[PDB]
């Protein structure tokens, strides 16, 4: 892992990105977000997932802004957003706040979603419960289905067992496992110090402020061992999507990826999926942002014509 030579030239630091955001109160808290505003007959909502924030998409978004309004939130208790009122950050806690925030955005009827990780989960579940509000869905390293077996997955079974135990609190709240260990480990390049600090910033202090990054993984839809409600949520939106022939989709494969191999075949069962591949591990936006924006822009444009 080395620095890209020309990366400092173009680096957007967290504060430079925070300066380009705005806030909006949502129920009893608030949501920090980026919004390109223009071309609002359409909207593309970019959803980060665990460990990260809207900052993740900062070099991806410029490619698509020309063709459509882009909107990128910091998920509740992440990035520079407000905390959850009850201090709980499960998927449906996240859905609650996000759905409430959409109401305030002046979105079109048909929305374009772009999701990564649990951002994809959130996307897929909004789709399921608003099947008349979706124009297209792009996903990557996503929670496509429940899990029956670890076979095609990277060796994280024991990491997951541990996270589900009382050990997870030590990993994440004391030791910040997802920012300090998983994050840099799952980018091919090395992040600029300023870039890594903008990911740390939210979760710089020890303890409970780090909760969101521990809660997400505990949602994991394992048939044997998972929370049965999230297992139902996923299973439900998985069947919907399997049947969703007239819903144009895009899958961005990550190569070698982190669990792109695990989920690709699940992705294949969603009809109307265009398949592209880029270089990366789990957090591909930091290894192929432009290849990524290009593929996305192309897709969005084909889906508006």
Q: Cα–Cα distance between 26 and 30 in angstroms, integer?
A: 5
**Which residue positions form the known binding site for substrate?**
159, 282
> CATH fold of 1-305, please?
Rossmann fold (3.40.50)
What string of H, E and C letters represents the secondary structure of 98-130?
HHHHHCCCCCCCCEEEEEEHHHHHHHHHHHHCC
C-alpha 162/C-alpha 170 separation (Å) is 10
Residue 57 a catalytic site member: no
Name the packing angle between helices 117-128 and 228-242 (round to 10°).
70
Please give the structure tokens belonging to residue 287.
Answer: 């290894």
- Which token pair is 208? 């409970």
Report the C-alpha gap between 136 and 185 in whole angstroms.
31
DSSP string, 210-258: GHHHHHHHHT--BTTTS-HHHHHHHHHHHHHHHT-TTS-EEEEEEEE-S
Name the DSSP class of 270: S
In angstroms and rounded to an integer, the radius of gyration of the C-alpha atoms of the chain is 18
End-to-end CA distance of the chain: 41
Distance CA 108, CA 40 (A): 8
State yes or no: is 180 an active-site residue.
Answer: no
Catalytic residue among 17, 59, 282, 286: 282
Angle made by CA atoms 298, 299, 301, in degrees to the nearest 5: 65
Domain boundaries, the chain: 1-305
Q: Which of 35, 117, 145, 253 is catalytic?
A: 117
Q: How was this structure determined?
A: X-ray
Would you give the distance in Å from CA 243 to the centre of its chain? Answer: 23
Resolution in A: 2.5
């Amino acid at each position: 892992k080395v620095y890209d030579p020309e990366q400092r030239k173009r680096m957007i630091t967290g504060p430079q990105w925070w300066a380009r955001c705005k806030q909006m109160n949502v129920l009893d808290s608030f949501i920090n977000y980026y919004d390109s505003e223009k071309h609002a007959e359409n909207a593309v909502i970019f959803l980060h997932g665990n460990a990260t924030s809207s900052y993740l998409w900062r070099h991806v978004v410029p490619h698509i802004e020309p063709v459509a309004r882009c909107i990128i939130p910091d998920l509740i208790g992440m990035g520079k957003s407000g905390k959850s009122g009850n201090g709980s950050y499960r998927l449906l806690d996240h859905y609650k706040y996000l759905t409430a925030w959409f109401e305030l955005l002046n979105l079109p009827k048909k929305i374009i979603f772009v999701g990564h990780d649990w951002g994809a989960a959130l996307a897929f579940h909004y789709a399921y419960e608003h099947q008349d509000r979706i124009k297209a869905i792009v996903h990557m390293e996503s929670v496509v289905d429940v899990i029956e077996s670890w076979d095609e997955w990277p060796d994280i079974e024991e990491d997951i067992a541990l996270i589900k135990s009382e050990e997870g609190e030590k990993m994440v709240l004391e030791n910040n496992f997802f920012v300090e260990t998983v994050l840099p480990s799952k980018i091919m390049r090395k992040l600029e110090p300023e870039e890594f600090a903008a990911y740390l910033e939210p979760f710089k202090e020890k303890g409970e402020v780090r909760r969101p990054t521990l809660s997400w993984p505990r949602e994991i839809p394992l048939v044997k061992g998972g929370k049965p409600d999230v297992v139902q949520i996923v299973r439900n939106y998985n069947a919907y999507l399997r049947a969703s022939d007239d819903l144009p989709k895009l899958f961005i494969e990550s190569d070698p990826g982190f669990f792109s191999n695990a989920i690709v075949e699940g992705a294949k069962k969603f009809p109307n999926t265009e398949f592209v591949k880029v270089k990366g591990l789990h957090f591909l936006q930091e290894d192929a942002p432009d290849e990524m924006g290009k593929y996305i822009k192309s897709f969005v444009e084909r889906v508006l014509k």
